[PDB]
RNA sequence: UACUAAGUGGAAAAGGAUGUGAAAGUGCUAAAACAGCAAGGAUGUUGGCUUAGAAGCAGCCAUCGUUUAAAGAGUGCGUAA
RNA sequence: ACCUCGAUGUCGACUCAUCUCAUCCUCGAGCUGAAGCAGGUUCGAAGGGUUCGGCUGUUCGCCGAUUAAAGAGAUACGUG
RNA sequence: GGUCUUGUAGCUCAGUCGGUAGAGCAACGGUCUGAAGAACCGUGUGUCGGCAGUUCGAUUCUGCCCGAGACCACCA
């Protein structure tokens, strides 16, 4: 519920976290300070009641699909899943799936290889 | 009525005095008189002191856009004229090239190397094109943005004096704007709606009923303002629109974005 | 209520009933109202 | 004007439609094809309408064959005229429907488009259209 | 021995029909068929493009891959998002 | 080309009007791209009603004004 | 329904019964011209109404169609 997708960096615009009841500073100001680390890459986000909803925010683990536009040797994203630019290594892929390792629901290599490629054989990369 | 305009503007002046928020202009661009206000039933009850107190009567009118015109590239020309008045005879035979980009306005280029024109027939043509290109064949609207090079003419004997040449440079570029099919142009506005989401869906509404464009939506420190790109024509009517449909809980601004080529639906209706 | 001389579900939800032996069509939206066949 | 390009005779019998087919029973070149329960006269008219109801729904694939032509004509005498003059004009031409013939055919498109299209055409015409699948 | 619910019979066309009775091909099911009901229906996934904002769901490329009886860029609804 | 021409009173105007709804209004009601007012579409519905003047022989037709609205088809386009 | 005619260049016109598409004007260049009128040479335009045949070959010859033009079609 009031799921929020949005980057690294301010949390101003979006009208799905901060419309619950959590106050925009005084996150924003942790958020930009703490996630400055992770800033430019989307970090989705979640909320929850937790007596008034004063203050409850959580975040998924960042997931790598975000950098697997650049992994796939792109700088801005493609319409067509059918076009190649550039040769991706198998070690990436492999620090792709460790790095959404604790990220995905569930926790094997080659599942989350297989999910990588099923998210990526529509965005215009195939895996190796 | 022209006793109607005159009897406006002492209307208007004296009710300036009562009422200087509002401005009143006669329009250099259509004639008609400019009147600002701010509101439905403002303006209205302004008509209705008008009617009563200066006892002006006049019916509603309607604003309209300059619709400034562009065209095509023209054949080269031939321009001719050949008549026997201006004191003496006059007969000229003219070719340049009149090529319309908007990137760039009129330059003239001069290639005469056997002697076809002496220099003396140069600035008047190049006066006469500069002079020439500020009506239009659709409706009179300016031709801007146009490059004249002179290629070829003849002059006849002791004849032919100096209105010749202008005189078939303006038949010539008349000819050049009917054949090439010109199309218009409008100013697009940038209107930055503000409503704290209350009348968001009442937004896409207003805009899409003008055919519109709404893409999305982005807030502004306490509010969230919705850039839309808006034709000139249909932003009078849809002051009262967006008002209406937010209950009177918006406002907006309309500033020049940027000059768009006329869609073929105002297009259709310039063709006689 | 209106007439036709072919009745199919138009819309996903128009059912066909027959009411005392006269035929009709019934939907989630109004507009979507017929009756003969 | 669908016309025969040489015509011997151009005022005959007007025509006797009813009968069973004479040849062409079976889908030769396309995929379904159109069965009429009963035969008729089509005029020029409504075999056109016919003809572009089916081309507007039939798709850049699928391809159509023709197993009709108007081979005869029709005439018409105009209003308050005495009987007896001999014969009118031919005005239009027209195509003789045998019941139990195929008229179209289409192929090279996927069924529910076929389909969709006969269903389409079945109502541009009085004679009571029906539906048949590739045959041999 | 059967049909009919229209007084059809005892007036009619194209077309429509989830109509009735019957016949035959085949499937599922008492280890419980279609249900309803009680539920889950997740995940990369605002996948990427589009318009600062179009991102389960305007639309477009692919239209898949995992946990998995099962989960679909989702079955539709609802948003400019 | 049909009974009827050892006659089948036919144009128009007034009067009797009557019938029917494929209803114009009044009415009930459904739906809507039906905010209200103002609507549109549709089913039922004949109980009742559906204006007057100028012009042309004129119902036709034109014009003007007016009413909830100022219907249409039939009776030898009824009525010597 | 017949009796027939008409449609040709940007305007109005002929159309070697098949052997071409043509001036003038609309409009342009040049030439002569006390000036200017003046006249001449020639730039340019042509599904010859459309479609089919016929014809060595079609605008022409034939048929059909469309747009237009005149002849009658409810009585003792």
Same mark, same amino acid.
């Given at each position: ?21 959590? *106050? ?26 937790? *007596? ?27 319409? *067509? ?23 995905? *629901? ?23 | ?42 303006? %209205? ?106 290629? %070829? ?48 869906? %009442? ?70 | ?37 | ?16 439609? #009813? ?71 031919? #005005? ?42 590739? #045959?041999?």
């Amino acid at each position: 519920i009031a799921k929020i997708n949005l980057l690294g960096g301010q949390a101003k615009p979006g009208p799905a976290l901060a419309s619950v009841g959590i *106050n925009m500073g005084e996150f924003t100001k942790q958020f930009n300070e703490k996630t400055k680390d992770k800033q430019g890459e989307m970090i989705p986000c979640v909320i929850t009641a937790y *007596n008034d909803k004063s203050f409850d925010f959580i975040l998924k683990t960042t997931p790598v699909s975000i950098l697997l536009k650049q992994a796939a040797k792109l700088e801005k994203g493609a319409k *067509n899943a059918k076009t190649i630019v550039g040769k991706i290594t198998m070690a990436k892929a492999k620090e792709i799936a460790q790095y959404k390792l604790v990220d995905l *629901n569930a926790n094997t290599v080659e599942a989350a290889l297989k999910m990588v490629l099923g998210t990526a054989k529509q965005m215009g990369i195939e895996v190796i | 009525t022209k006793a109607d305009q005159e009897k406006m503007s002492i209307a208007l002046s004296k009710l300036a005095e009562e009422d200087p928020t509002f401005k009143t202009f006669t329009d250099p661009e259509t004639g008609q008189t400019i009147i600002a206000g701010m509101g439905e039933l403002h303006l %209205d009850i302004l008509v209705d002191r008008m009617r009563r107190e200066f006892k002006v009567e006049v019916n509603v009118g309607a604003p309209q856009v300059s619709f400034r015109e562009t065209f095509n590239k023209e054949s080269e020309v031939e321009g001719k004229y050949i008549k026997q008045s201006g004191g003496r005879g006059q007969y000229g035979h003219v070719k340049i090239r009149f090529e319309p980009n908007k990137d760039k306005g009129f330059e003239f280029v001069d290639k005469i190397v056997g002697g076809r024109i002496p220099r003396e027939y140069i600035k008047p043509v190049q006066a006469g094109l500069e002079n020439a290109m500020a009506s239009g064949p659709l409706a009179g609207y300016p031709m801007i943005d146009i490059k004249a090079t002179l290629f %070829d003419g003849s002059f006849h004997e002791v004849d032919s004096s100096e209105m010749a040449f202008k005189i078939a440079a303006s038949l010539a570029l008349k000819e050049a704007g009917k054949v090439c099919s010109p199309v218009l142009l409008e100013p697009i506005m940038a209107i930055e709606v503000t409503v704290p989401e209350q009348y968001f869906g %009442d937004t896409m509404g207003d805009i899409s009923s003008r055919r519109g464009l709404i893409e999305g939506t982005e807030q502004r420190d306490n509010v969230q303002v919705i850039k839309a790109k808006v034709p000139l024509k249909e932003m009078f009517g849809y002051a009262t629109d967006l008002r209406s449909f937010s209950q009177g809980r918006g406002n907006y601004v309309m500033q020049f974005s940027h000059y768009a080529e006329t869609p073929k639906s105002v297009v259709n209706e310039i063709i006689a | 209520m209106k007439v036709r001389a072919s009745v199919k579900p138009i819309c996903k939800d128009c059912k066909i009933i027959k009411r005392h032996q006269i035929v009709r069509v019934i939907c989630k939206t109004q507009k979507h109202k017929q009756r003969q066949g | 004007m669908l016309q025969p390009k040489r015509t011997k005779y151009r005022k005959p019998h007007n025509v006797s439609y #009813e009968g069973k087919a004479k040849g062409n029973s079976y889908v030769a070149f396309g995929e379904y094809g159109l069965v009429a329960t009963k035969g008729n006269w089509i005029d020029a008219r409504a075999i056109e309408s016919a003809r572009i109801a089916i081309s507007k729904c039939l798709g850049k694939t699928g391809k159509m064959w023709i197993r009709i032509f108007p081979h005869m004509s029709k005439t018409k005498k105009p209003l308050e005229v005495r009987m007896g003059s001999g014969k009118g004009n031919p #005005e239009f031409w027209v195509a003789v429907v045998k019941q139990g013939t195929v008229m179209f055919e289409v192929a090279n498109i996927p069924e529910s488009q076929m389909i969709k299209a006969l269903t389409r055409a079945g109502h541009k015409l009085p004679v009571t259209w029906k539906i048949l699948k590739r #045959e041999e």
